[PDB]
């Protein structure tokens, strides 16, 4: 019916794929991933002849383009290398070698700045720039009526656990692809069962949450279930089980927060009264009549 | 409600270099007939859950005598 | 249309005929990006697990609000026959078709495909200087002789046998000329890819000799549709009537070659737009002085006006023309109906003209919302003077064949005139006339009935 | 933006509400109507219809 | 509990089920204000 943009945030983090390799039986479940991706990308391309790719890596500095590669690059170049075999299609071809010559710079790159270790994770940048992406493509309309879909590749592994400073950009992306209609997919690689705001993501942008355990057998899931394109979302129901509550956490004890109390000023979420009588994020001072109204128990006969 | 050393993670990124200039065999992500099938049971039992849960969503019409 | 067209070739190609066509990963690609959206869907879903699918996994797929999308699907599927149904355990399952399942598989993930892309030799050509001049001169070429206008150069004999075998461009020897028809016009229609496609179509069904394999005509045509344009290719991958075919799409503009017989040839710009597509030149203006202005520069759009439009001058961007009685009536002779005259006038109408439209609607619905009205882009004066001009060619019609009168008993003639009427014949009937009238084809079941 | 002799910094009260999912439809408690789907709010469990 | 006996011996199993159904988080809410009502009684009198 109509082409869409299939733009594909993938999360190749070095210490989150040690671990991810250290608790399964195999080893290097990156290249298992990456090609699962490359079959994926070119079903994507064979759906429909219009229909376009993009492919944004999150490593461990920051996040970098992979299909297609940098203008710079274009202009300076072709070390044509022969990962890729080169008698299969050709619209497919020239696609699957600029992701693999980029996945190979990129690895390369960190492995000559692999002495430097963060623990700021890039993945909601990563998306933030598909979405750029997303609406550059769609305002450029060099194709008209052209849909787009956010696939993101995840990985937790059980080693890193929910990240606090994710939760406003992601937040965030969800707003802005509920505004441009582009359904978010979400496919965790990993251990941990839950992830809550990428579940979030998946339920407010009508897009498709499944967690996977073993890297084996990935083409299936994405050829199955992460195979809808906007075209027919509406006809086609999503496979995502595990209904998240779209609950919060507070800000001083971190908690999954119940019946609460936020704050009027900066909307922080705190499951207690906090001490002090001001607001920890925001500070604040707190009246005292109508905390004490808050503090009040209630009613009953002796 | 297990801390990765630097010098294992180079050994597999080097891994990783290794077996992606070798050869990216991409016929391997065909599943062993198998494996395919657990993961096409797991995704229409999901299906299945959610077109019961979503198969139906001015108040609606009931059973009961006016 | 033109994937409603390609499915039903395929759908009446025979069984076996797709399974031999469905060896080619390229052919197979085309024939899946034919397909409906659940039915794409549904095909890369089930082609990665070996094993069993029921129809019932793919009906709980679909929402409740698309099921007449997936019976369309499935239907479709069925008639393609890239779906086996199996009658076993009490569950009707569904297997993809193996042939299909393997040429996919392999197009998608890269391994042995035979050649079914072909192979590049790195040496081209320009393709907007060169390749699209070759092709669009082609094009040309074979739709101004096909609109008539006098041409210092003909196309070939094999396009031409191929028009006057076809269902358009009828053409008499007593003249000597060639006639655009009704479906001939229409082809000016409908964008140049459907009129390759039904050019291709009506080409591989008058394909019926022992020189021609169609398994590999249609893998050679669906390869030029996956190959790219600027690049060149070789004709060693090539059986031999895909290489007598290559020189027809050479002579077609399909494809260039720099020499006959050489190694090497090169896909132009339609073999892409093949597949799929992607002020306007053409674009007219339309009086309630029936005075056309069309701002058109190319020739082959100035020969399409001159069919029904009285030209009267011409410049660079536009040419003057005049609607009028006796070049409708030429139209309408050579059998363009005024419904896809009017048609034409919509499709090349001008922006300006939508725009007034657009007022003349806001101001309508601004004045009466009670009533709804279709946007009149051109002048109902002219319209309707198009199809009144229709309606005085079509004054009468005329059909030939017996009436049978004379009965000096009524009951033989009501015999007579319910047999013609059950076997559905006649055209008119009466006692009181006793005159019952039946067509030519239809006269030899009645003489027999009367003579036996 | 409010002004700065504004002194009306408080908590206020309030709880997420579960979404309720169920295939057979309830009264609902804001507008006493048959819903399918709904949210259940965390203090009193009683549904509502949007937030 | 009244309706709900009512509807039993007047339609018998087949749709009190259903007023069941359509009465339940009603009254689990009242259930739950009634037994927070009985806990906080009874942290009061104990
Ligand atoms: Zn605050
Ligand atoms: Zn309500
Ligand atoms: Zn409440």
């Not at chain 3, 009267?312 to 609607?323: S, W, Y």
Request: glycine fraction near 4%.
């Amino acid at each position: 019916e109509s082409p869409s943009l299939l733009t594909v945030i993938i999360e190749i983090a070095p210490k989150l794929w040690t671990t991810f390799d250290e608790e399964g039986n195999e080893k290097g479940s990156i290249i298992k991933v990456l090609e699962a991706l490359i079959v994926f990308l070119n079903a994507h391309l064979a759906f429909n002849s219009a229909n376009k790719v993009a492919v944004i890596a999150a490593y461990s500095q920051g996040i970098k383009y992979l299909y297609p590669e940098s203008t710079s690059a274009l202009k300076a170049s072709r070390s044509d290398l022969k990962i890729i075999n080169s008698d299969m299609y050709r619209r497919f071809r020239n696609v699957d070698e600029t992701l693999v010559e980029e996945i190979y710079k990129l690895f390369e790159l960190e492995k000559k700045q692999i002495e430097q270790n963060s623990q700021r994770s890039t993945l909601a940048g990563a998306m933030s720039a598909g979405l750029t992406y997303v609406n550059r493509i769609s305002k450029e309309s060099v194709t008209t009526s052209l849909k787009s879909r956010l696939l993101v590749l995840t990985c937790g592994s059980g080693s890193s656990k929910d990240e606090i400073f994710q939760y406003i950009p992601i937040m965030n992306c969800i707003f802005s692809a509920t505004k441009m209609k582009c359904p978010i997919d979400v496919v965790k690689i990993g251990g941990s069962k839950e992830s809550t705001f990428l579940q979030q993501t998946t339920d407010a942008t009508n897009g498709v949450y499944l967690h996977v355990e073993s890297t084996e057998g990935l083409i299936q899931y994405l050829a199955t279930a992460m195979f809808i394109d906007p075209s027919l979302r509406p006809i086609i129901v999503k496979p995502n089980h595990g209904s998240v509550d779209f609950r919060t956490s507070c800000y001083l004890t971190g908690r999954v927060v119940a019946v609460g109390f936020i704050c009027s000023v900066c909307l922080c979420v705190l499951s207690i009264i906090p001490p002090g009588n001001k607001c920890p994020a925001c500070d604040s001072q707190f009246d005292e009549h109508v905390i004490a109204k808050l503090k009040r128990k209630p009613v009953v006969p002796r | 409600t297990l801390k990765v050393s630097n010098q294992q993670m180079l050994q597999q990124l080097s891994l990783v270099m290794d077996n992606l200039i070798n050869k990216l065999d991409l016929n391997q992500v065909v599943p062993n007939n198998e494996v395919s099938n657990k993961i096409n049971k797991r995704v229409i039992t999901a299906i299945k859950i959610n077109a019961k849960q979503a198969k139906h969503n001015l108040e609606v019409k009931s059973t009961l005598p006016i | 249309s033109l994937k409603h067209s390609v499915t039903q070739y395929l759908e009446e190609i025979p069984q076996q005929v797709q399974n031999r066509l469905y060896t080619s990963p390229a052919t197979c690609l085309a024939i899946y990006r034919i397909l409906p959206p659940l039915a794409k869907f549904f095909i890369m879903a089930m082609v990665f697990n070996e094993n069993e699918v029921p129809l019932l996994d793919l009906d709980k797929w679909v929402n409740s609000n698309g099921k007449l999308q997936f019976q369309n699907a499935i239907k479709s599927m069925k008639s393609l026959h890239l779906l086996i149904p199996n009658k076993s355990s009490g569950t009707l399952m569904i297997n993809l078709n193996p042939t299909f399942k393997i040429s996919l598989r392999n197009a998608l993930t890269g391994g042995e495909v035979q050649n079914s892309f072909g192979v590049v030799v790195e040496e081209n050509v320009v393709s907007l200087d060169l390749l699209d001049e070759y092709s669009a001169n082609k094009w040309e070429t074979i739709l101004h002789f096909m609109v008539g206008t006098p041409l210092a150069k003909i196309p070939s004999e094999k396009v031409l046998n191929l028009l006057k075998h076809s269902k358009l461009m009828e053409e008499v020897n007593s003249t000597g000329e060639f006639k655009i028809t009704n479906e001939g016009f229409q082809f000016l229609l409908q964008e140049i890819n459907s009129q390759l496609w039904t050019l291709l179509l009506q080409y591989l069904k008058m394909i019926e000799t022992s020189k021609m394999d169609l398994v590999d005509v249609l893998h050679f045509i669906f390869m030029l549709g996956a190959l790219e344009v600027g690049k060149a290719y070789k004709i060693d991958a090539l059986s031999e009537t895909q290489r007598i075919m290559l020189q027809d799409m050479r002579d077609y503009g399909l494809v260039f070659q720099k020499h006959s017989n050489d190694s090497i040839f090169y896909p132009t710009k339609l073999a892409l737009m093949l597949t799929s597509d992607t002020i306007p030149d053409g674009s007219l203006i339309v009086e309630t002085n029936f005075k056309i202005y069309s701002y058109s520069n190319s020739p082959l759009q100035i020969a399409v006006l001159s069919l029904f439009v009285h030209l009267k001058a011409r410049f660079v961007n536009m040419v003057l023309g005049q609607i009028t009685r006796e070049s409708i009536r030429r139209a309408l002779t050579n059998g363009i109906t005024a419904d896809q005259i009017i048609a034409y006038l919509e499709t090349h109408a001008h922006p300006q003209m939508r725009r007034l439209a657009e007022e003349k609607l806001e101001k309508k619905l601004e004045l009466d919302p009670n009533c709804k009205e279709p946007l009149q882009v051109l002048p109902p004066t002219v319209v309707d003077q198009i199809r009144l001009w229709q309606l005085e060619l079509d004054r009468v019609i005329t059909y030939e064949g017996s009436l049978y009168s004379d009965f000096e008993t009524s009951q033989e003639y009501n015999l007579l005139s319910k047999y013609a009427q059950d076997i559905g014949v006649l055209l008119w009937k009466d006692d009181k006339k006793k005159k019952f009238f039946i067509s030519k084809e239809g006269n030899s079941q009645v003489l027999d009935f009367a003579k036996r | 933006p409010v002004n700065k002799i504004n002194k009306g910094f408080t908590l206020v009260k309030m709880g997420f509400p579960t979404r309720i999912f169920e295939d057979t439809p309830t009264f609902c408690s804001c507008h006493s109507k048959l819903v399918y789907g709904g949210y259940f709010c965390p203090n009193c469990h009683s549904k509502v219809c949007s937030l | 509990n009244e309706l709900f006996q009512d509807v039993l011996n007047g339609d018998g199993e087949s749709m009190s089920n259903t007023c069941t159904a359509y009465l339940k988080p009603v009254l689990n809410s009242i259930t739950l204000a009634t037994h927070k009502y009985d806990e906080y009684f009874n942290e009061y009198n104990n």
